[PDB]
Amino acid sequence: GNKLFNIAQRILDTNSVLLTERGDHIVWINNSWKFNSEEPLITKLILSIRHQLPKEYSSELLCPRKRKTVEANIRDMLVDSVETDTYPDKLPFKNGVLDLVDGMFYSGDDAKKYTCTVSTGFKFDDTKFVEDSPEMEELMNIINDIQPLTDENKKNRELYEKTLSSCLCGATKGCLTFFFGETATGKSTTKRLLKSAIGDLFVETGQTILTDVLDKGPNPFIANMHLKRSVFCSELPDFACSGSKKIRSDNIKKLTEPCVIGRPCFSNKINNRNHATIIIDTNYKPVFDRIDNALMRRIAVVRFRTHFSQPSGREAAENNDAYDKVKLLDEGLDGKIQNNRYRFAFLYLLVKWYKKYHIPIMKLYPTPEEIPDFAFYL
Amino acid sequence: GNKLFNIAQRILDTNSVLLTERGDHIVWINNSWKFNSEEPLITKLILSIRHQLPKEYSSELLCPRKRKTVEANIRDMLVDSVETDTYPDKLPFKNGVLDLVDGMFYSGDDAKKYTCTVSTGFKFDDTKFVEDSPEMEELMNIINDIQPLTDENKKNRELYEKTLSSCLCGATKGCLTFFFGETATGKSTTKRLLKSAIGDLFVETGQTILTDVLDKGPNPFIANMHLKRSVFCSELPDFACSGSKKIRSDNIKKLTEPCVIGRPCFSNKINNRNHATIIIDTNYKPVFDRIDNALMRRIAVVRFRTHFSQPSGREAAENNDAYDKVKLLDEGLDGKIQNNRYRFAFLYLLVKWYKKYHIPIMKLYPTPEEIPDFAFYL
Amino acid sequence: GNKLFNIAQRILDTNSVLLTERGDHIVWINNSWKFNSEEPLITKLILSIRHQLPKEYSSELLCPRKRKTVEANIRDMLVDSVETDTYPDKLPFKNGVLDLVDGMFYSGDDAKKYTCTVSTGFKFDDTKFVEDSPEMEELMNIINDIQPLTDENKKNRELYEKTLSSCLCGATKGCLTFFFGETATGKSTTKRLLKSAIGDLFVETGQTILTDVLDKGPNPFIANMHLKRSVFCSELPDFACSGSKKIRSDNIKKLTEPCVIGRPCFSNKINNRNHATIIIDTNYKPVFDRIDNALMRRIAVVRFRTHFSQPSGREAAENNDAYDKVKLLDEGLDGKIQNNRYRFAFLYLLVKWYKKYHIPIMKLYPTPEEIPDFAFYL
Amino acid sequence: GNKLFNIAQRILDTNSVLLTERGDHIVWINNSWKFNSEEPLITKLILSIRHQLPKEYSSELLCPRKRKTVEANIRDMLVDSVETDTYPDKLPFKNGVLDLVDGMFYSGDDAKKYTCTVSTGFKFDDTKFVEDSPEMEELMNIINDIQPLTDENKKNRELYEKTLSSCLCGATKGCLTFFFGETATGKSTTKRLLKSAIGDLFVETGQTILTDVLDKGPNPFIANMHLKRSVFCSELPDFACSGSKKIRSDNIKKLTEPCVIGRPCFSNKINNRNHATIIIDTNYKPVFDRIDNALMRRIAVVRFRTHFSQPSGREAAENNDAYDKVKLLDEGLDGKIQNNRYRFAFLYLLVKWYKKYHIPIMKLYPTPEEIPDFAFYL
Amino acid sequence: GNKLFNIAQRILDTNSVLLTERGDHIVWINNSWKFNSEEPLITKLILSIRHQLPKEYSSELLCPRKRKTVEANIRDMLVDSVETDTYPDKLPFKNGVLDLVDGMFYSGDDAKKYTCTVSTGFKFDDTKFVEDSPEMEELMNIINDIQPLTDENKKNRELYEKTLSSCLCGATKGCLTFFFGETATGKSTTKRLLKSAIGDLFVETGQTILTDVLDKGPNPFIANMHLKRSVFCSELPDFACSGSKKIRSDNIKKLTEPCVIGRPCFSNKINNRNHATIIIDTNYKPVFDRIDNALMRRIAVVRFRTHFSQPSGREAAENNDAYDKVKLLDEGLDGKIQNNRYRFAFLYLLVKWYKKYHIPIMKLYPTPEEI
DNA sequence: TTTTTT
Ligand SMILES: Nc1ncnc2c1ncn2[C@@H]1O[C@H](COP(=O)(O)OP(=O)(O)O)[C@@H](O)[C@H]1O
Ligand SMILES: Nc1ncnc2c1ncn2[C@@H]1O[C@H](COP(=O)(O)OP(=O)(O)O)[C@@H](O)[C@H]1O
Ligand SMILES: Nc1ncnc2c1ncn2[C@@H]1O[C@H](COP(=O)(O)OP(=O)(O)O)[C@@H](O)[C@H]1O
Ligand SMILES: Nc1ncnc2c1ncn2[C@@H]1O[C@H](COP(=O)(O)OP(=O)(O)O)[C@@H](O)[C@H]1O
Ligand SMILES: Nc1ncnc2c1ncn2[C@@H]1O[C@H](COP(=O)(O)OP(=O)(O)O)[C@@H](O)[C@H]1O
Ligand SMILES: [Mg+2]
Ligand SMILES: [Mg+2]
Ligand SMILES: [Mg+2]
């Protein structure tokens, strides 16, 4: 029969082209589910799959006028839509899917069954994803300097590890976190270390979504956190200076449901899946709109008490009560952090903590007995 | 003469392609009506029906350029439009229509007269639609814990059942329902169970449809409520605070009308069909701009008075006067909801309730003796 | 010579295709003038007229690539434009034009003379257009309950009849009517009956047409009421609340003009012909920015006083002065309205009322005494 | 040599297609110059000039694909622009140019010299352009009623005649006339008479051209008033209200230049020729943004005094201050103007007035002493 | 082979098509560097140039699709852009250019090296470009009447001549001129004279260019000054009130730059080359955002002290202090102004003044001794 | 501002 239809049927039998509910046509090229709303990539898959089909078909898929016919046949056989990103314990890279339960790494068809549209952005190095490397020792030194293992810092370190490790789970979390500490403590260092580990599954969204009604008009500060594993918010100002807004309590309750309401510019889609692990990076203790039992259930605080200063104010910083350690400020850190040195070394630590803390079910618990207002209300 | 016109005529005689009043071309593929404003699906239908014509006609539909000719002929033969969704007592799925008055599943031509352009988005498996199941007992235990079967909570339970079961009828409901209660009481669990049950006939919007005006400029928060059978507008703020917009009474009055005025972006269609049951999962007592009988005859309140807590906070919850019974939290409940485990059991429960409350006429009644301001005006 | 040129000239000899001043190519299919700026309509008529040409010509029109050549010729032979909708007292249906003055129904070539570009959207049943019928008997009871035929409600009843019957004549009306009354008095029932009666010549818009500037940017709320014979703008909010926009004084003046300024999206046409009977379904008395004699001559108010109540709250309706009668609510009325039961009985009633007040000349008059502010100014 | 090139050259030899400085392609069909960016005017002309070519060149213009080739050649052959609408004392009609200074109606090729692109839209009849006729008597009575010939209404009647007769000359004016007066006085009747007299050369625009900056993207409210003789911007609101825009003094400077900017949707033509006679039908005297000495020289105001009252409210009008005559209303008058009964009578009256004020030089003079602010500044 | 490619190469070898840095293709048809971003004129140029090619090639350009193929080839072979409008001493017309250093009119290939994309809007006829004419005498009388040719107004007259004549030099200018006077003193008369003389190389703007930042929102008032040789800013309010925005120093310091940063509606090109002599006409004393030494080196002002009133108001205006001579309002003066009879004469005066003042170096010197 | 355009 029509031999340009047999090619389309054979290509479709591989389940390489899929139709999503949002109207996209996700394709499977180079071990990744890529999609582009502006230009479909079906003709890319048709040309890439050329080697699987027999020799009698390969000579015909080179002409673009035949590739267009094959794409037209394919688009008329995808009738139903499927579901995407339904596996929480899977981290999608640019060349496979890392399994978090047993720390495996599947590529090819083995990674095809997990339909994950998002990706980390970079490739996975099985040789660099090891616990025996000088990078791992350097990282373990940096982390222990930021958060020591002293018994005075026992719970605060386990909570920190839990919060950081929950940044790899593709499931909805029902608790915020507050990276609270004085200046020059490691919050922006932890943020940069985490961004170097996940990459594309990370946005440092604006502060405006703590004090603004995210309902009227456009708000791309919300539409960006669609399927993002981690969302970081900084810039908590003083609540006594002019412009002292209040962290809207009802707004905190909105960033806990699996679907957040908000649309981008020139768009009609109003619901965004909430896989984020929102971490508010603050320096001063936050002042809330109004405290109630519904608000105290979805907040955790990770205290930061360690100062990395230059040998000018070291003694003055030591005399201060806001810190507990006065370790020496290093300059090579920001060099080999933005340059992605401790990328896989931090990934191994995150996977280890994820195994230690959330194997059966991923869940974040509040710590309300840390904020003075909450302590008063308790 | 032209056989590509005979094919189009034969396809037209089957009454598989129809023209709607909005200008869409609804096709009939896989026992369900489908449409897409961006790209027509007539070619999909032409290629699909190919298995119902003789051999001399079944081979001509493989070439896309010969399919566009049939599509052009079909578009040129459709003159007069039709009206859709005229049957309120039917629930459409991806593979047929369930008749609620008899609880009978019709597939194929048996369910084609009921031109339902919407669907739940999943198949209907008749093996999970029975009482004899382990999942049904678990769902019964969950619901009887959220709303206990006592005698001080009998009218409330009946109102809750009526409100939940009204989400299957595709008619205009003239009441607004508030899910009022303290934190951790079962409101979001009910919302998620309803979403799993009715599937895609369920849209969650922001609160901007109650505090802003739905007339100026675009408003896809209202344009998305077209032909949807349930709407959730949860997370009401605290109107007792300073700077909280009250609920506009006129906005409440619009939402209980057969047609709601509101347009999407880049669109001129200004009218949308209101088949939705609007439920406001609130946490505080609502406050309105003005109170009058027209507002008092459109509001119903159902209360949640069962707190699900951990053993850690089990003691502070018993002294609270906002609860009637304290149960133990279930950490794994959320996992087997997003997996659609209690999906068809809840569907059977809703159908059973609809068979009991809304058989002759479907109607929702107000409960003015639940808001203190309404009680004063009573 | 050219077969297709002769085919195109023959179609133009039938005077079926026409060009209007607005730039629309109206065609004559199924005894009705139809126009649509996006769908292919000239090819539709070309395919439909096929059973007029001889056999040697009737076979070429089965190829879509040949039906576009004939359309291209027809679009080139049309030089001059014509004027449409110049008869005010003719009501067009989907299969003819009803003459209001005498009641004769023309179908076929006799209806081609009145170039009415709009239509009701359904056929005209001469069998149901009779005075003696069960539905006509129930409708009379419904109306006599909504507006009783007493002696203190005779001027109001005749004003209501005038306003309702004026929705059939396609001429500019220089007055706006307010359906005033407390809740549950029969206004929405009248609106639904009118919508079922006049069909497509009825558009419902928001109150943005009353309090906004209807001139800047796209505005499909004004662009949609082009040639519509009735425009309902319900849901007027309270004005006693500080924060409510008053009804703009000049908008009322602009809406009573033979041509309204406003354009839809993706278009340049800025003039819409005003045939509408604008009816505002309000609950409280309207408040304007400024009151002047230029505005009291453009406003009429008709009151609804019969209250339809449930047996429980019936007693409370006997002490409110806002009612003159307490009828018992019929729960099944809305079922047999959306099903188009009183469609032709109401049409007969509207025609009978029309040829009793508007036969010499159709004109509407204001009632300034029925509004407190105008009463003060007068 | 070529066959489809000689046809294009011959069509050019007839001087039927011309290019303007704005990029328009004006064609000559049916004794009139026409330009339309949407319709295929060049292809219509190619089909219509088919009889003036040799027999062998006539049989090729039947196929649309040959006509498109001829049109493509014609577009390439036109490399130079020509001046259009240079004669200001000529009035175009659907079938020829009428000379205002002399009075002879130039029909056919004799009207080709005066390249008048715009037209009135209706054929000119010399049997109705007569001086004496019952229609003329009725029109003269109506005009004398609207503006009485009394001694006080002498300096105002001639200004009214000047303003009305300036709408025939196709030259840029320098004043903005305000039809100031109370309600039911005659402004709308005068506007309707002028519209029915001058046909297509009349347009009505919104108040954006006065109270908004006309330089934001597309603005068809300005692109529509290109080469139009008269423009109406009626129904001005009150300015001494809690929130209301102003006349934007700077915006009046732009409306007197012959280079008004503003492009229609889907087009690039930004600058439009300004032959318009801006007339604002208002009820309250305008309030500008800033009053300067450059504004009193481009503003004229004519007062309307004669009241048209119903027999009922006639006594209340005889005591009103802003009225000089209480002549009875006429219901059967405003229905006849839309029937173009006084079309040619009003055209003859306008020509008679034109050959009384605008023969040597056409110029509009301002009347600044009428506005209170300018009177105080004097 | 591929005769169409040979046709494209032969057409391109004549430098009839050029590519601009802004991404537009400028063609050369009928003695004019035309361009149209929406509909390209390359096919018109191919059909026109058909005559200079051999008959074997010239017989193929009659088919509209061969022309499109050659156009595609031409657009493919234009890789690098060229610098246009590099000559400041040339005034472009609709059918030629004018050389002010020699006062010579160039037509045809004699004016193709001078790549002048913008034009004036009308053709040139040198027969009416001579002093020997009465309209010459009437216009010279008007000019000496608006600015007396005496010793009490010598420096003012020379600065007025310099500023008005600078409007022909197609280069950047670093001095903003102010026109100071009372009502009915001759500002708008000079404005209409300039608009009639030069035409398209002239844009009239509003007060907005002195009160708002030039890089917010879609603003053509920064983009419309592309290659324009004049900006006559009017509608300046009285600065002795409340709510009337004053003049910003940053605005003035920005307008005196060779390029201006500003993006039009639906466009990304923020750069616009500025060649405009900015003459702001005022009615009262100006006040700026700040007064410092960085500003008085770019601002010049001239005075007008002659007012015109009708013979009815002759004695009513013959007794005023703000003026010194009062003739009668001439209605016929404005008559042959939109008809543009007094167009080439004023052009001749401008050329004469340019030859008198701007031959060696083009430079405007500020006069901070009057404000 | 966005949306509308485009
Ligand atoms: N483990 C460490 N040992 C020594 N120096 C460190 C260590 N971690 C971070 N620093 C240095 O201290 C600084 C900490 O800054 P940081 O606390 O991230 O800023 P912020 O307080 O704004 O978040 C960094 O610039 C880094 O160079
Ligand atoms: N029988 C039960 N029914 C419903 N939820 C239960 C039950 N037992 C434990 N839970 C848990 O209690 C939690 C209640 O939270 P929820 O009521 O959804 O919050 P909200 O106050 O926003 O409605 C849920 O996460 C659920 O997993
Ligand atoms: N003539 C009638 N007889 C019996 N019931 C009626 C009649 N008219 C209306 N009803 C019922 O009473 C209710 C009136 O509500 P509605 O008229 O919509 O309120 P409103 O007038 O405020 O819009 C309707 O639901 C309708 O079913
Ligand atoms: N010459 C006339 N003789 C009698 N009635 C007239 C005359 N001119 C106008 N009318 C009446 O005046 C009415 C129009 O008033 P209109 O001009 O719309 O008021 P406004 O000036 O407030 O717009 C029409 O209904 C018409 O019948
Ligand atoms: N020197 C002059 N020669 C001829 N007419 C003049 C002269 N000065 C002023 N006028 C007259 O004054 C009017 C313009 O005055 P102008 O100073 O431009 O005020 P505005 O700027 O408000 O128009 C013109 O109509 C012109 O006839
Ligand atoms: Mg919740
Ligand atoms: Mg109602
Ligand atoms: Mg009027």
Keywords:
14 helices; 13 strands; Uncoating factor OPG117 (chain E); alpha/beta; 378 residues; binds magnesium ion; globular; part of a larger assembly; 5-stranded parallel beta sheet; 5 chains; 3-stranded antiparallel beta sheet; DNA-binding; binds adenosine-5'-diphosphate
What's the gist of this structure?
Chain E: This is Uncoating factor OPG117. Chain E: Residues 155-317 form the SF3 helicase domain. The first copy, chain A, is of the alpha/beta class.
Description:
This is part of a larger assembly, with five copies of chain A. With 378 residues, chain A is of the alpha/beta class. Chain A is built from 14 helices and 13 strands. In chain A, strands 8-9-12-7-13 form a five-stranded parallel β-sheet, with helices on one face. In chain A, a hairpin with a 4-residue loop joins strand 2 and strand 3 (33-34). In chain A, helix 7 crosses helix 13. The radius of gyration of chain A is 24 Å and the shape is globular. In chain A, 35% of the residues are buried. The complex binds adenosine-5'-diphosphate (5 copies) and magnesium ion (3 copies). The structure holds one DNA strand of 6 nucleotides. Chains A, B, C, D: It comes from Monkeypox virus. Chains A, B, C, D: This is Uncoating factor OPG117. Chains A, B, C, D: Homomultimer; hexamer. Interacts with OPG148. Chains A, B, C, D: Residues 155-317 form the SF3 helicase domain. Chains A, B, C, D: Belongs to the orthopoxvirus OPG117 family.
